[PDB]
C-alpha cells in the first residue's frame with residue numbers, strides 16, 4: 073500500500089526507471105505486484121506469446137513477465153532496468169535448477185550488468201519449502217562475486233518479507249546511480 | 250478494435266452488464282481480450298489463487314478467468330452475467346473433456362440460467378485443431394435444449410472469426426430484457 077509508496081518516493085525524479093521482476097511461471101510474481109498496491113496491473117502482449125504485466129508507479133515502472141517456456145524484444149526492456157528482482161518458488165524443488173539457468177542467463181546480458189539483484193525466496197509458508205540459505209546455494213548466488221545482490225525470504229500471500237526486501241532494493245537504487 | 254467497439258455500441262444504456270469469458274488456461278482468453286482493443290486489461294486477485302482480468306468499455310465489463318483446476322465469489326459475478334463466452338483450445342484434444350465438464354458445471358448455476366452462450370473454437374489455425382463440428386459434439390452443445398448458443402471458429406492471434414461470433418452475441422444482448 074502506502075508503506076511501499078513511501079519506499080519508492082525517494083527514487084522519484086525526471087528519469088524513467090524500470091524494475092524487472094522475472095521468475096518461472098507461478099513463482100508469485102503477480103501476487104507480489106498486486107500486494108504492493110502501487111497501481112493497476114495492466115497486461116499487454118508485445119509479441120504473440122509474450123505476456124508482460126506492468127505497474128507504473130511514477131517514474132518507476134514495474135515490468136513482469138514469466139521466464140522459461142531468451143528473447144530479442146527483452147533487450148529493449150533491459151535498456152532501462154536499474155534493478156532486477158527474481159522470485160523463486162522455494163517449495164518447487166523441481167524447477168530451481170531452471171530458475172538458476174534463466175537467472176544466470178539474465179545476469180549475462182550486457183545492459184543488465186549494472187543492475188541490482190534482489191532474489192525473493194517466496195512461498196516460505198509451504199511445509200517443505202527450501203529456506204533462503206538453500207536457495208542461495210542452489211542458485212549459486214555466492215559465486216556472483218561481481219554484482220550487488222540480496223535474498224529476502226517471503227510469503228507473497230501473507231505479504232511479509234516484501235517490505236524488508238524492497239527496503240534494501242530501494243536503498244540500493246538510491247545510491248546505485 | 251474500433252470495429253469491435255461499435256459492435257457493442259447499441260448496448261450502451263446505463264445498465265451495468267458483464268460478459269464472462271472463461272475456459273481452461275492457455276485457451277486464448279487474454280489474447281482475445283487484447284485483440285478487441287476495447288481498453289486496458291487489469292489483473293486483480295479478489296481472493297488468493299483467484300486472478301481475474303477485466304476490460305471495461307462503458308457499461309460493459311469483460312470479466313475473464315481460467316476454470317477447471319464454481320465457488321461463492323463467482324456466483325456473485327454470475328449475478329450480473331448477460332453473456333458467457335467459452336473459449337476452447339481446439340488443438341488441445343486431451344482436456345476438451347475437462348472444458349466440457351467445466352462448461353456444463355457453469356451452466357448448472359441459476360444466475361447463469363439466462364446467459365447467452367457463445368463458444369469460440371479457438372486456435373483454428375493449427376493443423377490438428379478440431380473444427381466447430383467436432384467441438385460442438387465433444388462439448389455436447391446439442392444437449393442444450395434450454396439455451397441460446399453459437400459456436401464460432403476463431404484464431405485469436407490473427408483475429409479470424411472474432412467479429413462473427415461477437416456480432417451474433419451482440420444481437421442476443423440487443424434484445425435481452
Ligand SMILES: Nc1nc2c(ncn2[C@@H]2O[C@H](COP(=O)(O)OP(=O)(O)O)[C@@H](O)[C@H]2O)c(=O)[nH]1
Nearest residue numbers: 097098099100101102103195227228229297298
Ligand atoms: N503458499 C503460497 N502461495 C503463494 C505465494 N505467492 C503466490 N502463491 C500462489 O502461487 C500461485 C502462482 O502465483 P502467481 O502470483 O499467479 O504467479 P506468477 O505466475 O509468477 O505471476 C497462486 O495461486 C498464488 O496465490 C506464497 O508466498 N505462498
Ligand SMILES: Nc1nc2c(ncn2[C@@H]2O[C@H](COP(=O)(O)OP(=O)(O)O)[C@@H](O)[C@H]2O)c(=O)[nH]1
Nearest residue numbers: 120121274275276277278279280372404405406
Ligand atoms: N496458435 C494459436 N495460438 C493462440 C491462439 N489464440 C491464443 N493463442 C496462444 O495461446 C497461448 C495462450 O493464450 P492466452 O491468451 O495466453 O490464454 P489464456 O491462458 O486463456 O489467457 C499464447 O501463446 C497465445 O499467443 C490462436 O488462435 N492460435
Ligand SMILES: [Mg+2]
Nearest residue numbers: 098101102125
Ligand atoms: Mg501471472
Ligand SMILES: [Mg+2]
Nearest residue numbers: 275278279315
Ligand atoms: Mg490468461
